[PDB]
Symmetry: C3
Subunit: 206 residues, 3 copies
């Protein structure tokens, strides 16, 4: 029961809502969760929303399951970082003799992997910068620029995005994070969808 | 004197500046003032700048008059709000049995109606969140993102938008809010445009 | 050695990277440095990215040499400010009797000239508001909105863009702002690029 997580377009007669996993599986250094989707802005596939991702830099991108990704959301990897221990001017890019000043792999600044948890909701037109971690159950307001990590089940927003409030009490969150329902076989998930939708799944699996 | 507020494109040989009332009056749950205009960013009509507005949720949008709306400005209504008591994932959206969990009106959160006063200037590419109230005579800096209420004759800007300073002394502000020149028949306003443009209408009228 | 700074497109066959100077020199009230380049977003020339710049307001825009400007960057000039001693509504624009209310120049508020220093890196989609000064060697994070001045060799980001941290210890900057390698005859720079790239320039030249 439920859509086919392997269908590029789960909804019939609908080419706006897509399933990420199928689109990104062909890619290197990219891990995506089963039912995470992206609601297309102008009909573009999500792979077009991932910028500056070169295998050589070996920075990875991980997205969990059951994530809701709004249109225009942009993931920036480490491909565009300019060497910064000195001048940030890329002389090497203009040939004519300057090619010999090509940076050294270990000379380029890498902030790390970008990791997005499970059950995350990212508003539309959100820009996520390199080396950012977003915990499970988190909500990122639209038009946000995420520069630093985001604690699980936190509600964040702004440019630079800050944590505004905690979705639930410390306790519950602790429970949910321990339970990890998105990690259950779908047959089960499928029978508690309503409890998952009202957070009671805690009072029964405890 | 002045153009006819009922004319969609008030200026001759200029299909870019448009009076909004005529355009939006043709919409459910929308109230627009008389001389409020919208400066097109690429030709599009303002009705296309209002997103996620579904009559079924019954959230209304109202805009005073003599509002200067910059290009690319965006208004987000309650149509994109995800259920949050538990998981934010839209199961119901994917059908195939999950339709079952379609959320109940009283379950989706509505922040209220969005209200934009009179004589308000909103910079270009400003994004306005749902359920927000903006005061009369306020100035909203370009590229801002309004998430909370803004008081009258306030200057605000940022993401999130914060109040930065007051435009005039409380005295003056207290007066304009009292006179509401924007509520006079235009034959009258017409012979005080200068006293309105220099804030002196406070010494004559009062 | 190095590319011809008078070339719009210094990289054969590439219409994406373009030198700003040979492009904007034809304009008035615009000063640009020799090797400052622009990384086109959709192939558009940098001149399309400078808005509301009218020679009658006489506000000037300055950019030094060796600046790296990412795609989408937007420079907003003063031709967009509204009178604000009273109503912000542009009565004059609609004519038909109201033109009489055209504002005199000393009534229009002007923040001033926009000056971007040398060896400055501005990330993608940054919007630079009117009358700002960005010091030498600064770095502005992508998706920033510059409302105020930015000291030299400072890393800034946000909306409003706020200084985050000093790129280097004062000692270095003080010497860096002194050496002014960007002003050296090209051939002298041609022999110290490596030194400039790792900041070892301070040691020798000083």
């Amino acid at each position: 029961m439920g859509p086919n997580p392997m269908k590029m377009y789960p909804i019939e007669g609908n080419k706006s809502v897509q399933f990420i996993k199928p689109i990104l599986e062909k890619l290197e250094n990219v891990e995506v969760g089963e039912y995470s989707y992206y609601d297309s802005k102008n009909g573009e596939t999500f792979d077009k929303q991932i910028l500056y991702h070169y295998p050589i830099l070996n920075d990875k991108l991980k997205i969990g399951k059951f994530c809701s990704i709004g249109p225009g959301v942009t993931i920036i990897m480490n491909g565009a970082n300019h060497r910064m221990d000195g001048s940030t001017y890329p002389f090497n890019l203009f040939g004519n003799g300057w090619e010999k000043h090509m940076p050294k792999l270990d000379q380029l600044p890498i902030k790390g992997d970008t990791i997005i948890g499970n059950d995350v909701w990212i508003g539309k037109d959100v820009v996520i910068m390199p080396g950012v971690k977003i915990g499970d159950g988190a909500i990122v307001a639209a038009n946000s620029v995420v520069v630093k990590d985001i604690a699980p089940y936190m509600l964040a927003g702004g440019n630079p995005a800050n944590e505004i409030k905690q979705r639930f009490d410390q306790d519950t969150i602790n429970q949910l994070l321990d339970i990890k329902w998105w990690n259950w076989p779908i047959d089960i998930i499928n029978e508690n969808i309503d409890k998952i939708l009202d957070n009671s799944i805690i009072r029964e699996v405890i």
